[PDB]
Amino acid sequence: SSLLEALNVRVVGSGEKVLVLAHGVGTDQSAWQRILPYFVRDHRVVLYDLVCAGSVNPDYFDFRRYTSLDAFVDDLLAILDALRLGRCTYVGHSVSASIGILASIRRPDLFAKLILIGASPRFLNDKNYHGGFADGEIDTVFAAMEANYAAWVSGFAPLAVGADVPEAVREFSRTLFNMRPDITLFVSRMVFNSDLRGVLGLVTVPCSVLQTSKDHSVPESMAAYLKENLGGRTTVHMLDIEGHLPHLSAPNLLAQELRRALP
């Protein structure tokens, strides 16, 4: 159950151009805090928290509804329809890249462009498809998270940040610790098992695939896979930034690439 205030939707900035900044699992909209300065001067920047963000009242997280990314797409589309700001450029990091992809195929009218950071249509390896994870790989990760959430965060946040950026590890550790562990585990499992490869061809809006350097969850070959399989006009931008969270670890460089990717 996700309302406009429930997901902490905020519109900051000025300008007719609308930018949507959509964070991934483990953080909230504060993940974008350092990127906002680069766009509020000429964008009305739409931010919101995924239902799973620690900044959202966990009672709003319905376990029987959020069994697929589609319910997340419902929230995103409900927000853009609630805001009624019209055509917008959507920036989706990780799961929010998948959410934006699925949202654009339902409502291509809403999105002038998709900017996809840390995007993967499927983490599991498959037939000639390398997602980056074998069958047994993620089990130990979900095990550590359920067994000792704090020890898991202490390891996962520096891995997710990648580069030695203590402020990024701090911010990501914080938002991870703000999430109820059963929600983190449930969403991470749901998101990890999602497979969007079959709908990439249905995308019609153009996409910018911002591929980050050393992503524990996204191989570099994923950028080319998304280019080949996304159905719209797709440009790949291989980020110099290392790590799954370039918006946290190198916001100025990321913002530069983000600005360049805008329509």
Author numbering: 0, 4 to 265
What does the article say, verbatim?
Strigolactones (SLs) and karrikins (KARs) are two classes of structurally related molecules that mediate signaling pathways to stimulate seed germination. SL and KAR have been reported to be recognized by the homologous proteins D14 (DWARF14)14–17 and HTL (HYPOSENSITIVE TO LIGHT; also known as KAI2, KARRIKIN INSENSITIVE2), respectively. To elucidate the structural basis of ligand specificity, we determined the crystal structures of ShHTL1, ShHTL4, ShHTL7, and ShD14 and compared their structures with those reported for ShHTL331 and ShHTL529. All the structures were highly similar to one another, consisting of a canonical α/β hydrolase domain and a helical cap.
In contrast, although only one D14 ortholog, ShD14, has been found in Striga, it showed no enzymatic activity toward Yoshimulactone Green (YLG), a fluorogenic SL agonist that becomes fluorescent when it is hydrolyzed by AtD14 or some HTL enzymes, despite possessing conserved catalytic triad residues. ShD14 and OsD14 have bulky residues in their pockets, such as F125ShD14/F176OsD14, W154ShD14/W205OsD14, and F194ShD14/F245OsD14 (corresponding to residues 124, 153, and 194 in ShHTLs), making their pockets smaller than those of the divergent clade. In contrast, the corresponding residue of L142 in the D14 group was the highly conserved V143ShD14, which avoids such steric hindrance. Consistent with the results of the Y2H assays, a direct interaction was detected between ShMAX2 and ShD14 in a rac-GR24-dependent manner, as in the AtD14–AtMAX2 interaction. Moreover, the transcripts of ShD14 remained unchanged during the conditioning and germination process of Striga seeds;28 therefore, it was likely that ShD14 did not function in germination.
